[model samples]
Target chain A: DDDDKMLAAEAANRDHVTRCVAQTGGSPDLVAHTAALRLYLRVPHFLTEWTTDPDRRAAVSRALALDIVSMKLLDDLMDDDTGLDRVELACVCLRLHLRALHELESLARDPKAVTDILEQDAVHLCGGQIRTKRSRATNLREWRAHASTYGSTFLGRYGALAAACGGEGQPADSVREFAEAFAMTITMADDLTDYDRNGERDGNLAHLMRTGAVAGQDVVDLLEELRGRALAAVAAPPGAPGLVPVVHLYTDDVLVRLLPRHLGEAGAGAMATVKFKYKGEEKEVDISKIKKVWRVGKMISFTYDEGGGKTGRGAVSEKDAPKELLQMLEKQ
Target chain B: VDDDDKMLAAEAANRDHVTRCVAQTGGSPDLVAHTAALRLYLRVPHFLTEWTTDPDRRAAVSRALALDIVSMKLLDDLMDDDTGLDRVELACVCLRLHLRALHELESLARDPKAVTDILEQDAVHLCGGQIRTKRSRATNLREWRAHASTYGSTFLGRYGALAAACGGEGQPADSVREFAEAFAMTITMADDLTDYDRNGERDGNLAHLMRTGAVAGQDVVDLLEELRGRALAAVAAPPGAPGLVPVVHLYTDDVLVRLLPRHL
Candidate 1:
């Protein structure tokens, strides 16, 4: 029956995504498609825990899906150098926010509380994204400093939404408490995994760990501590009944799936002799796979093979190649 | 091109518009009229007053929108490199105007949700447009045009929608949006022409782009004619808000006729 419900949710979510995506007046882009694919996995799974009424779940899920996807798209627009049309992206964001707010208001037990949460959370969420470059502080210190803002930006809003739907009063408070801790843990995990992709960005937690600014043990302890805080939160009065199991499942997913593979690699020294096997590992063969440079008419591409021969390329204006990347690539 | 009479009429209209806006704010007339918001109130949206049939509704909405516009203008000015403003005073005033605008519009609207929703969406568009416009760098004049009409979907467009909501109908026509945007575009073209040298960034002004030969010899006349057609066509044919027709024609003619001296 859970399976059946989830399947139905997936079907409904697809329809919602289709309609929401259609609001932008073009064929859906890969970014939105992939986001739908990614969100489809967990959003409905969690929605089931929050509500048993199939109809209510379907309706709220539509709003939640649009909320998260639009927020993600807005982030991507700010975060990536990728070419998303500014006008279209703005259109989609407006359309999604307007619809999401209206729907969220309609579906909530207390429309006042729900819309207030949306407004407050949206300010917090979008604030960092729109923040001036020099004004940004993405360090562990600042990360810890503005935990509520960061948490709401990433996941706490969803938790607040959960509270509005099921718990309504004290549950909203506890859920937020749980979500901030949960947000910290998950983002730490993300920062660690994105270390290589981020190219030694100092803000990354893994980079801090690698450079001895923060101990790996300290991070692990913090991660475990945050998870414990999250669990404690869900155990409180006017309980967030659904979120307890969710907290456990999600922490396991991050810990069991990612922590070992990536954290183990984070500790390990640099790579092999032009392609070889590690101890008891199925490994590949490749040479000159480190990094490469390409030049065409008035343009140069800096590329790196993240092993398995998938290369990443970057370009710029009147643009000099990244001196650091070039120097690093020039290494033996 | 040199229609002094038409230009003089618009100037007098601008004075009256700003004077009424100053009275609406109840702030000191000299102080209120000099602010960035007054400058904008004087320049734009006053024509909405002419386009509306319901005197009471249009008047209240105009005051609300004036408060809204100035509040946003002051906020933007404060955020930019405005050194003279007392930070706390400026911030409080901005909030005061914003809160009053919301309440005023709410009290006035028949369908609060529709008007509020229209207002909210328009604010975001203008806000987002400001952000996007700041971050964007257009390589050529052709590229800059995309950012130009943003006001159509934004500030002036808000006026367009609100005019219809206050006066005409259930929902504003899409052509009205097109109409408002064309005027906004033409206005920006005129602004670029007037403030030719003072524009901040390389791509900030159309005049600069043209002068640099980024896309050579693309005249303002060309864009004005096209925009004028779109604005006229929008009212004359489709949006069919009869009041807007003459206002659109007169305003656009005023802009074109005033600019002719410079072109000559």
Candidate 2:
């Protein structure tokens, strides 16, 4: 019964996305909102798309958890933190999924399979603009929003929380600061995800900056401001503890080890999204029913057939696929 | 030999076309007749309004100036340097024009709606300054004027004022003033966005310098953060004062805020 529901959800997400992409004529503008809504509604299926890559998937897990925790922490810190709720709730769902993925990884006998899954199948789909350097570079206001959110105080607090959880000494203001950082993390992720679609409308920092218009020039004065609010706690009679460095250690351990390990299981696998199309207006062909042949040379081509021979013909190149998706077409 | 012959012919044809353009537009009985009748002298300079009297020398200087201007404004500044005093001061003018054009829309927010309406007409109806012709060619000012005139028949005043505002700064916080600020902002923001040595370092490096210049003295970072910051930082102000924080702040933060408020 559980497996059937999972299949249905997967089918719905894939079908809806296909219809949505076709309806929009594959416009980049519609990709993010449509995809985000789909992912939110069909969370399990969205997870199914990537649960193949262990390390990359794990990185995704750690990154999502750390980020969620960080953002929740930040929301509590803000004087007026109403706007951050939707983002925090979304990250919570991701954390639960990440935890599940982490469990799956631990259960696997061959831990090495984790790396293989990440390398091969864990693809980041649904964000064309966010995954692009072009989008990141050009949008100015967006870039600033992304940068400001990553300040030391917010990042350090979350790192400290993770460190404490990882058996490190009790960080100062463990609960308060950690929660605020978690909330901020969601805003940052949403800020980035906004670039996935609606970059022109939502937040594309690089485009607004338009750096090429004015080249070969200087801009600012110093770094004390950017150092941001680290910690209010004064260390001891001995000396003030370096919160920034401890935070960095915490950040690295969480992002590199904890997150990656978790996502690796959830997203690592021979992931495929099966869709059906009209062949002479009749063939009810699922992608599973299709003769999945991979071709090299500029694009990944998939063919489908009912009885025997390689029959139905429709192809999508790596170019057409989502940015993070690696279209593996064997040189057939 | 054949290729050389073709190259010579192509060059000769290109020269002929340029000659025709100059002869037709530069000095003609038509120009004299129009000017005499209308009592409006053509705004073109003697250097451009005349035929190739000293073609060799003028051509050489023109080519050199174009190349040098592209590479270094300092060199262009030196080219205009006459007897140790700079005579050709249009580098700032050009720079100012670029900045003002970039921020024309923002300038309107600060001005009265009625005055802003008048200024739009002036931008198109009025045309002067050396940089105008060059910039017009690059940006097609005539097309903008005609398009606004024909299609924007109702709000012609506002459209023209905005168009006119584009070429030069209007009033105190005109487009020209805005252009200067925008130019400075562009330079600084570019610097900040640049990824140099550090992944992320302190000490307010070049990267920091650029980022600071972007926000200027304004406390707000997003348009969405400080709506008034966009409106308050008038582009058309005379190079310095409150309008200059976003520009001069590139060098000194104290000087930027000391002369201007962080938030208006």
Candidate 3:
């Protein structure tokens, strides 16, 4: 009864929001925290829809696979391009950020130390970068663009919707930590990808504190060590704060689970058949993400797209209100 | 040039610091020698006593020398074969370089009387230009090959004399000659190897020193063959002076015949 009653209430809110949005010309409108949270809360319905609707489910599955593959390709390109000299450091900081997220999750559960610890870690881990008005403005813009691009992808809308529905039961600490940690990683990645000519001339953060923070010569050294640690961590078991299921979905499930064993039937494993439209004919596309996942034993990732980034048509019902409304307030 | 960058003895502190850091940190020979000279010009930072003379310091310095097993020490290790001989020879060569540099740096450091005996020795003349030249601005590349040769022969001689001082082995003459042949052979191979960009070209000193020496046993023979040939060629191809045929022929026979039975 409680479940049904809650669902009925949400369904009403969902209908109201959808009509209001469509009336205002809402064609995949840009979603803020509130909207993302509201949508995310309706994940159960989407998952259910994906399971029941053959056409919708197939599209979602394909999109999910493609989104993961695209991410893999993007990551490789970033490496090949040197993305920035200090990009590796950014990656290191990102892992640290994940840990911070875990920290936030645990602290949120405690509700006592969450606020204080978050503030302190924010200052120390971010190197006071986030606190500055200029940095805050830049990050805000970047976050918006990230959200917009994500929304453009098929499964992107799913992710946004999930966020809107609220990260309930995920704990406030988990949400805070995840956000902060992801932000840190992005910041570090930004510095690293642009450290060479661009960062050198502009003096990126990684290079800015060369003397006191980390020596220039140590850049290569730190990266080598970081890479080694990352490799080892990937092979090892998950930590105390159980890793998110979604991150594992791509690497352990899609990658390792499908790779053809050396002794087994050649190519008999779970091969992800990818189809891309070429001249109106469906052409197969190679799935490199599956290979990378198996090799690394895990991905340097935690975040993933919704419906795996599927693009499809669906009607919003009143029960989907959780996924259509609640706004997320950016940290001050 | 910027006055600050100019390496005058009067302002040798920065140079001395750099030299000490590289030496302790296994800095390259060029930088080492350059900075040591500044200390020489300033005549400070006296040579620490031989590692054998003091056990503890000897251990640390020996460890430092061993660390070079990856760098220039490999060349040193290749030169002297007999364990007692090699260790003693290594100590002496290092000490002699230290003493000479100290004498220069000591001249700058505050002890002109320290190496007056060594400077006055006519042996320093017969030894080569390594000791004869007074410290001066124009003296950096005064005689590249000759002094390098002087350094080679003198290091062998110093090692032999040190072995004599340590009461380690046979007649000093035979000992000196034996080490000299090995030293010459080693240096020559090192020179030839340096010509190749790979092997031990990078700043990984030990790696560079034993560039082609990764293969241990029979490979030494192949290395020796090439090494002997290079030694003869270098001795004959005088960089400035006339071809020293006697030294070349003598070392050639010594390397092939004398060294083969004892070492090979």
Candidate 4:
């Protein structure tokens, strides 16, 4: 069953990480946290048909997990190193990267492109990293560029390695393109979901939207559009059937679980028809009749009367909160 | 500096290239120009002229190397510590550095296999050293020495490329690389020796280990002298190169003479 394979696959990599981190000293809590591990856990599953063997699949996931985590540690050290013991961080990163490379070398059926890829990717990531420094994006076009080089290429490496290790030909190409394409959507989703944290930054997609570069468009419309492009790139392809579902988990389930149910329009008239989703239906609300509005973990949740002694409760992501949201919430 | 060494310095090319880099990229003037990249590039190719005679290729190699060095330094600083260019300025300056360097190098050779080959090796050396150093996060001189020499070994790779660029591909390039590597190691040892008191404990000082406590000063001197010996032998390699054997001997001996009174 897919469930069995996915669960076992997750477990295998977890053990792999635990074993590697165990050999060293520090707690792997931040490095191998559940949220980070979820990103690469599905990579091996993308190549299920190529390597039907559970052992190879598990091994592929292990290598991918270690290597991706290695890249993650590098990224964190590059961007933020608060409380990081550089020696420990560096040691863990190297051990994981070295072990992954060694395992990949051992697993290679023939002379493969392992070292060359490492070299190229290392060189490639230099520019990718340089492009998004201080994170400056004036528009969606530029933001898209950042999204690709800044995060997507590195993100795509997990799938590229999955394809390189497990499959070949069109399947590999399809998987890699899919990985990059999906990788394309990640940063945009991040800027959207994480806007409350750093949305003021000029480079984020959040900045682009708020700055009117991608304004006048519904926030959900933009998310759907980008997600659609990712799906368009991969859904019709082969050797990655279940890859679609995992992207949903990455984006829909995690990055975008709490999208704004209401959108302020290009004009002030949008305030008159403040709407929200309740029980899977869009319902306009009377601002004057709001029972209560409160913050729920960076999102705005509110209770309102639906008349006839009925009431409705809804939550809106602060990222796409209404123009009058604060004012509405501020009222007694 | 000797009259001939001073003549080959090509002061204009080094200053001009950096001046043009600063003008082309809108970054801090001080940060753009005041880098070890320019200083080291000028000094590295001063000795490499023996490997190649073509003045254009020599100038081209020197200029491109400075740009590459600049980018790598920024890359290293960001990864290890954040003191220089903020993220935005880094994006601008680093790429401009690559682009200008790319244009000059493109003009330097005709379908140069050795150019890319040397670059790949140089990159791999730095990359491997970076990975290992970061992994070790160590101050043990024995362990840190390999990573410390990475910056030095890169000059050898450039020298090899210069040899390859000027029709001395196989035998001469490797020997020059060996000589360069030896010299690099020697200089690296000096760096560790001199910086001992200030940064010895923090950065794994060789002098403290060799001079103050662990081993005798004669042992360190002998190691440097042997390195000088190896450099002389490598630069003396045949194919009728210039009188650079003694020139190399002078340079290596000069390095040791300066160290004798200090670290010893």
Question: Could you tell me how far off, in angstroms, the CA of residue B215 lies in candidate 4 after the best superposition?
Answer: 5.7
The clash count for each model shown is 1, 76, 68, 1
Angstrom error at residue A89, model 3: 46
- List the candidate numbers ranked by DockQ, top first: 4, 1, 2, 3
Compute each candidate's TM-score over C-alphas.
Answer: 0.55, 0.16, 0.18, 0.59
Candidate 3 lDDT (Cα, 0 to 1): 0.30
Please tell me which model should have the higher TM-score, number 1 or number 4: 4
Tens digits of per-residue lDDT for model 2, B152-173: 2212223223333322332343
| lDDT, candidate 3, A178-275, per-residue tens | 33222233233334333245324422333333322433323333333433332333223322122233223322332233222211232222333333
Q: For candidate 4, lDDT tens digit of each residue in A1-332?
A: 77677877777776776676545543556444423556455454554434555576667767877777666665555555345655455445545655676566455543334544443454455545655664577776677676776566776656656656773343555566666766665565556655333323333565556565664344445456656655655655444455667667655742335333122333222444456677889877766567788887778888877766998787877765665765776674
Better of 2 and 3 by TM-score: 3
Candidate 1, B82-101: lDDT as tens digits: 33544333333443455455
TM-score of candidate 2 versus the correct structure, residues matched by position: 0.16
3 versus 4: better lDDT goes to: 4
**After superposing candidate 1, which stretches have Cα over 4 Å from the reference?**
A1-11, A27-48, A108-115, A121-139, A161-170, A195-203, A236-240, A260-332, B1-112, B115-250, B260-264
Tens-digit lDDT track of model 1 for A1-332: 55466566666666665575564442356335534555433453453354556567667776676666665554444343335554455445445655665566566675355545544533334333233222444445654544445443456776677557643244566666776777776666555554444344544455555555665555556667887898888677755466666666666766676555545644322333132323555433222343665555655444446646676444432144344334444462
Error of 2 at A323 (Å): 38
Those runs of model 4 whose alpha carbons end farther than 4 Å from true positions after fitting are: A1-71, A87-149, A152-168, A171-177, A192-217, A235-239, A254-256, A260-332, B1-30, B34-38, B41-72, B79-168, B172-177, B193-217, B238-247
**RMSD after Cα superposition, model 1:** 17.7
Candidates 1 and 3 compared by TM-score, better number: 1
Instruction: Provide the lowest-lDDT 10-residue window in model 1 chain A.
Output: A268-277
